[PDB]
Amino acid sequence: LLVPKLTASVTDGAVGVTVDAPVSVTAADGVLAAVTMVNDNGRPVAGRLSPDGLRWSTTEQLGYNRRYTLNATALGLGGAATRQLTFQTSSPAHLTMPYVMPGDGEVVGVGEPVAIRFDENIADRGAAEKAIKITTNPPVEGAFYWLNNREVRWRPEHFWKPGTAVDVAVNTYGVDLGEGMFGEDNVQTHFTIGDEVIATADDNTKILTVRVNGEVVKSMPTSMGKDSTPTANGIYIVGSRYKHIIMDSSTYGVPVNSPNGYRTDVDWATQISYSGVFVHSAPWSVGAQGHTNTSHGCLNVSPSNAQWFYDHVKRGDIVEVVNTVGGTLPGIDGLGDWNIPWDQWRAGNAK
Ligand code: NA
Ligand code: NA
């Protein structure tokens, strides 16, 4: 006749216990007759015992900077055993909150990366990547790449296949993200890839051609950046859209009062770079559209075409610019992810 045995997921006297997982107690050669866990203030922690009496677990989120006391008794035909354990959880120096894009339940285009933006610099990028679980259906290979010290992106080698489900579980609560900075909470999002929409602006023709699943559906005369402030070549991801917006160059590093500065209220504006490129309505340049470049970088189109673009293009669709006198959009722009070669993206930069 064996005495029951108790196995807890913490050890008496432990410090730095992480709260990324529940606390449990298991009985062998007996069943759990009593399990309680209280915090430093005497408040009971919610838990649940399995129907067979063998395993108890906490059922609510456990706190940072706690001292918990666990009491457990097991009974079997061979006798009884009781244990009391006290332990302390992680004490962060700092917290950081993740923000995930795109939005939960959204339908997005074939260029949309998964984005996890933290509100603090992440000292241990590898710990953050490890805590982020990305599910794809149909499953496709992808990889993480950091655009800056706070935001990481995940995407496949090529544009997504329409109809792919994407799930993002950012399981950062209880995780040490370096230098004592712990996740403030978990976050989650799920999204789906819709139709393939790729618009190409060719400086040789000054036409912006929109293709939906490979077919031309719209051909828009455009006026892009003038030679002294050109539109960069490259692949741009569609971001947010606005019925109207005041474009303020100081938002993009350029003082309004300086030679290339501007502040302009425009209609039907679709953002395609963090550096401030938009497709938008430009009634003042309709004469130049299809003929000469006049802007500070934006793709000027007619009011009707800008509204069409707003109505028919969605976040994650693609604009490709070719044959301008500019350089190439930086891969770390914020919407320039696809300009980074796959071998470099795949290798990452977690360090
Ligand atoms: Na993952
Ligand atoms: Na769609």
Residue numbers in the entry: 57 to 407
Sentences from the paper on this structure:
In M. tuberculosis, the cell wall contains high levels of 3 → 3 (meso-Dap–meso-Dap) cross-links (approx. 80% at stationary phase), which are formed by the l,d-transpeptidases (Ldts) (ESI†).6 Evidence has emerged that LdtMt2, in particular, plays an important role in the virulence of M. tuberculosis, as disruption of the ldtMt2 gene results in altered morphology and inhibition of colony growth. Mechanistically, the Ldts differ from the PBPs through their use of a nucleophilic cysteine rather than serine during catalysis. Several β-lactam antibiotics, in particular carbapenems, have been shown to inhibit the activity of LdtMt2 and to have anti-TB activity. Such LdtMt2 inhibition involves covalent modification of the nucleophilic cysteine (Cys354), which reacts with β-lactam antibiotics to give (a) stable acyl–enzyme complex(es). Consistent with previous reports, the structure of LdtMt2 consists of two N-terminal immunoglobulin fold-related domains and a C-terminal catalytic domain.
To investigate the structural basis of LdtMt2 inhibition by ebselen, we carried out crystallographic studies. A comparison of our structures with reported LdtMt2 complex structures reveals variations in the conformation of the lid depending on the nature of the modification to Cys354. These results imply that the lid is conformationally dynamic, with the precise structure observed being related to the nature of modification of the nucleophilic Cys354.
